[PDB]
């Protein structure tokens, strides 16, 4: 799992 960003 890979998030980026708000």
Do not use: D, N
């Not at 799992?1 to 708000?6: L, R, S």
């Amino acid at each position: 799992a890979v998030a980026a960003g708000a």
